[PDB]
Design a protein around this ligand. Structure first.
Ligand SMILES: O=P(O)(O)C[C@H]1O[C@H](CO)[C@@H](O[C@H]2O[C@H](CO)[C@@H](O)[C@H](O)[C@H]2O)[C@H](O)[C@H]1O
Ligand SMILES: O=P(O)(O)C[C@H]1O[C@H](CO)[C@@H](O[C@H]2O[C@H](CO)[C@@H](O)[C@H](O)[C@H]2O)[C@H](O)[C@H]1O
Lengths: 649, 649
């Protein structure tokens, strides 16, 4: 047996780890399948993609085209349907009709043995006719055959009968394929919509309390949910909801020693009151949690729980499972670190003494929360636990519950970030917060929307409790408006951490990305009613952005994204498209000065001719413009951070 | 089971067709094996390459290094030994000693947990000693352990004992490797030296005749062999040596009809006198051929025969195997073409009626010539026969006779060129003749010496009977001198077609790459003696270039090649290295005007400091220079095309 087939079909993409892991999509998402296809000699080839669903059923006829002249790289767009494990192959073939037509169009006017050429054509169309299932399509081809063979008619007339639109239409649907050769199947994992698309909001239930009871409960925190839903969010991410250790508990502002009624960090999980399968006693009971989840569901909100595989020194595991920790020669366990960050309040887990025990307990814990309606987990620092551990855990959970979504909170080097996505994480945190200039944004999004989209789905949090970027610190409210527009329109999944909409931007100290008086170490009551009344919140802009996203399919996908040139460094422009929906975004990255610029649209990339002028509506204002190949914009901080335009129909 | 191992080792390279075809090397050739290696958490990893020979025996300890900071890409150089099918794996591991040393060097001078730190070190070195086979090496590590544990000595002294050169040497060779994780093996095909390295000379035996008998024989043509050997060539490539058809025979200058004693094209193979297993009667007998092969062998010349799988209309196959041809409805067979070239004197082979019979006959013909000492075949236009046909034929031949070298004459699109190399062709013709500017040469050789080197071995013919480039037509002798220097120093395999030495450069017409009065269609006697006496040959430069190649290992490999910047567009500079051998070449690509330039050498690429100045000898003249980071050159066409310098030791 040979490695190459009769008609070479090579290097089918997308491909992940040479086929050992699946490429990814979600229901309704389109993407390109491509291959290198050519044959020996000089005759034409054709190619098509065969996408098979989880029951092996092939999709519609999906012909490919050569993507660029002389490259022999062919491609076609496919669209994923129901969730599950699909497969795709590329079929390559000789295209004898295209070949014959090319020669015949030349030879017949030249008078070069025309009877012979026309008979060859007749014999080809006879072959084409035999395969065609449709009775009417068959009679149409056979009529062309008889016209080709009518020696009483002019050569040019015999040939023309073989080239009619009626005949073209038949062959376009049912081409004559020679020597059909197939690639080996590649796997496609199709997952639910929310894996790619959704708006996330992070908040601490304990901060949403009452005058008489400052520490929030699930019942008081449930009253915060309506405002979150009203802002258009789909997912609420909660920090760990478990009992918190007392040994080495951190104080306010990340001080080493807690005093008085300091509440400590939620990530310091575990006490004699319970571990990762238990609820902080001040938050209430599992029944109260069920109420919170029910209320969330009523509002169209899904819960994402933080899963942080680490222990306070008071966690029951410490003495129940000593081999789940690395001990020094004096028996002590070194506290966790993420250099230069130190986490004196927790121990990290060790995995090589009892990997089966840890995996078994991990999926038991996850299934407990799954049984109470949690179908999304935000996984804390997965890159400090073994990659194969997550591959195993995610495979186990999704094996029974393929709807569960895992988000990788891995801010680390690119190889690890990519690998975590490839081995199963549905979503990844990204470098978004550290990409703020036009060049940074353009280069990074070109990366994420390109080949990486075959295995990684970005979740653009504009802030987190650990990341208050200098851009926001220096820029104030207009900078918050800018990053919200960017996050919401560049990724189909974005998020903010509570307080973002209040433009909280006071750092721990100059040069830090930590918040002053961080919510991680103290209750952080916020007077939401007062903020709304006084208009000191960008909640309405957030709400508008999520509405625009919900109304425009272009913003609910990742892979179609194009950057358009402008003549100002501070002004970025880009378009996204999905079917007939086109969104055009122009953002002023300068939060302190008005910028005016000319935006020169790459019109063919919009499916428009260079001279055309198209009506657009700025969905942030309702204003309508007519935009073409060159457009004046004037963007004023605090007033017009950006244009978010839809192309009108 | 997980796809990713305990310590991730991913994307091992080289890889060809995702591991379905072998990467290539030849005996004594070095190349880099690389992989992406990293672990969870913040501690160190190491990695090493395990190269296994055809009997499965592993090579020497071969540790890898990270190739660039922050990339997690690791690499090491390996060297291929005896011919055969080898395999290689990458092993990755936690490197606890490197991590412990890093921390210890900090904590001990800071008085931080010193007794605990030193004991942790002692325990590591004990574990290291466990896997050390040599007793003196074990004792060296145990002495470090005992010193680490000596609480009566100062901490700094205890630490220093673990960091001695003697300890380091043991640990370098026998590191403590945690959690060793291996890639799946990848295949490597190691072939003989001549597959990569050799100088080729093409000539027509029939042109070397006598006054009485103008059509040369093998007996008369053998008289040229000493001159070819004296020029330093290793391989003689002969056009087809079989009978030539009379039907539709081509006349002089590729005219359609032969007249009188016209000899026709050797590629129009076959007559009643015999086919591909026969000798042209005017060349003599098989016994005469054996004599020619024997005489060539005595002079260090291997014979490469043309294998052109096509037929004149008079070939025995036309009536013996009609199904090896495509017949039109009137029974006629269309002549072969390579558009826009037409080959009215031959039929192309059709492969889909009897592919088994064609394969069987093809390997029968090859084995006939192999039995008569031909171990190299120049395969005519392999891209107009099925790719899998060659895959099958080459596998069959190399299965019994792995020394046989096949050269693909496929001037076509990149996908097909690459695929032919990948499915078994030992060597490939290239785009060399159409790369003449500094940018063209730099870009193309960067490609050939890069990733492509894992499956393709280039044969740089500076001309062929079909390719007289305009550069040579317009440039005259200085252009011939330049292209010879380039071909000879940029590829370990190069060649010329007879007459190149005489700077024959008259085209069929302006705009053509054909020779006027081409030797393909007529006997072409040459006055070799007169050219030697009148010095109107560049045979001495050709001789010198092959001598320089034979004396400098850097020129007998492909992958190590670096271009150095110059300040003149017409002047190119590059270096090649193999062990302690360094060759620096500077070429003036302008064949008409003197060019002066400053050559700015990338000194670290030469293994030198930027301030350093090194002695070089121009091997074309024997002159010595001292070259550093900035060197002046003045190259006058006709007087000197280039400097070909060795770095003196
Ligand atoms: O930068 P990262 O390490 O990825 C931030 C996340 O991980 C840490 C550790 O779980 C969290 O850090 C908080 O909680 C720890 C443990 O209780 C504290 O010591 C630390 O000061 C605090 O910042 C962080 O919340 C995660 O998002
Ligand atoms: O450009 P290419 O097609 O790769 C040139 C080589 O292939 C042709 C065909 O075998 C050779 O062409 C010569 O011989 C044919 C057949 O006899 C003639 O019709 C043609 O005029 C002549 O050039 C060529 O020698 C090969 O190198």
């Amino acid at each position: 047996p040979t490695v190459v087939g009769r008609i070479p079909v090579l290097d089918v993409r997308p491909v992940v780890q040479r086929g050992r892991r699946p490429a990814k999509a979600v229901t309704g998402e389109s993407f390109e399948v491509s291959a290198t296809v050519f044959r020996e000699g000089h005759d034409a080839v054709g190619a098509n993609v065969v996408l098979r669903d989880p029951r092996g059923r092939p999709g519609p006829w999906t012909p490919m085209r050569e993507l660029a002249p002389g490259t022999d790289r062919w491609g076609a767009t496919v669209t994923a349907g129901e969730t599950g494990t699909w497969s795709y192959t590329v079929e390559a073939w000789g295209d004898p009709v295209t070949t014959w037509r090319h020669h015949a169009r030349i030879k017949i006017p030249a008078g070069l043995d025309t009877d012979l050429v026309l008979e060859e054509g007749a014999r080809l169309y006879e072959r084409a006719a035999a395969d065609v299932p449709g009775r009417e399509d068959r009679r149409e081809l056979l009529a062309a055959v008889d016209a080709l063979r009518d020696e009483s008619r002019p050569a040019a007339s015999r040939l023309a009968a073989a080239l009619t639109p009626q005949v073209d239409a038949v062959l376009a649907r049912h081409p004559l394929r020679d020597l059909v050769t197939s690639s080996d199947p590649l796997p496609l994992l199709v997952e639910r919509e929310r894996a790619l698309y959704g708006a996330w909001y992070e908040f601490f239930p304990r901060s949403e309390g009452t005058p008489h009871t400052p520490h929030g409960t699930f019942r008081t925190a449930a009253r915060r949910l309506p405002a979150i839903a009203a802002m258009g969010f789909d997912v609420v991410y909660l920090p760990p909801i478990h009992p918190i250790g007392t040994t080495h508990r951190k104080g306010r502002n990340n001080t080493l020693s807690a005093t008085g009624d300091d509440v400590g960090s939620p990530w310091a999980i575990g006490s004699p009151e319970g571990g990762h399968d238990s609820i902080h006693p001040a938050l209430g009971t599992l029944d109260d949690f069920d109420h919170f989840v029910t209320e969330a569901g009523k509002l169209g909100l899904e819960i994402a729980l933080d899963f942080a595989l680490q222990c306070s020194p008071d966690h029951p595991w410490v003495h129940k499972h000593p081999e789940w920790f690395h001990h020094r020669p004096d028996g002590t366990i070194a506290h966790a670190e993420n250099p230069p960050k130190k986490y004196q309040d927790i121990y990290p887990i060790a995995f090589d003494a009892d990997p089966d025990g840890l995996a078994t307990e991990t999926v038991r814990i996850l299934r407990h929360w799954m049984d109470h309606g949690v179908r999304i987990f935000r996984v804390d620092n997965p890159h400090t636990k073994p990659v194969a551990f997550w591959e195993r855990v995610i495979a186990d959970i999704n094996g029974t519950d393929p709807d569960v979504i895992f988000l990788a909170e891995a801010f680390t080097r690119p190889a690890m970030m990519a690998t975590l996505a490839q081995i199963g994480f549905q979503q990844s945190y990204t470098y978004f917060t550290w990409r703020n200039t036009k060049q940074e944004l353009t280069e990074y999004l070109t990366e994420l929307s390109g080949e990486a989209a075959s295995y990684m789905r970005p979740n653009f949090f504009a802030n987190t409790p650990d990341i208050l970027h200098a851009y926001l610190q220096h820029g104030g409210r207009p900078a918050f408006e800018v990053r919200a527009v960017l996050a919401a329109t560049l990724s189909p999944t974005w998020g903010i951490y509570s307080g973002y909409e209040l433009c909280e931007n006071t750092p721990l100290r100059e040069g830090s990305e930590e918040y002053l008086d961080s919510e991680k170490y103290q209750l952080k009551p916020r007077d939401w009613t007062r903020a709304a009344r006084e208009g000191t919140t960008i909640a309405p802009l957030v709400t508008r952005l999520n509405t625009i996203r919900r109304e425009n399919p272009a913003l609910r996908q990742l892979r179609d994204l194009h950057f358009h040139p402008t003549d100002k460094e501070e002004v970025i422009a880009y378009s996204k498209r999905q079917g007939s929906n086109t969104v055009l975004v122009v953002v002023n990255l300068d939060p302190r000065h008005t910028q005016e610029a000319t935006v020169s649209l790459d019109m063919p990339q919009l499916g428009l001719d260079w001279h055309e002028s198209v009506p657009v509506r700025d969905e942030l204002t309702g204003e309508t413009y007519h935009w073409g190949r060159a457009n004046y914009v004037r963007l004023e901080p605090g007033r017009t951070p950006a244009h978010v335009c839809t192309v009108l129909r």
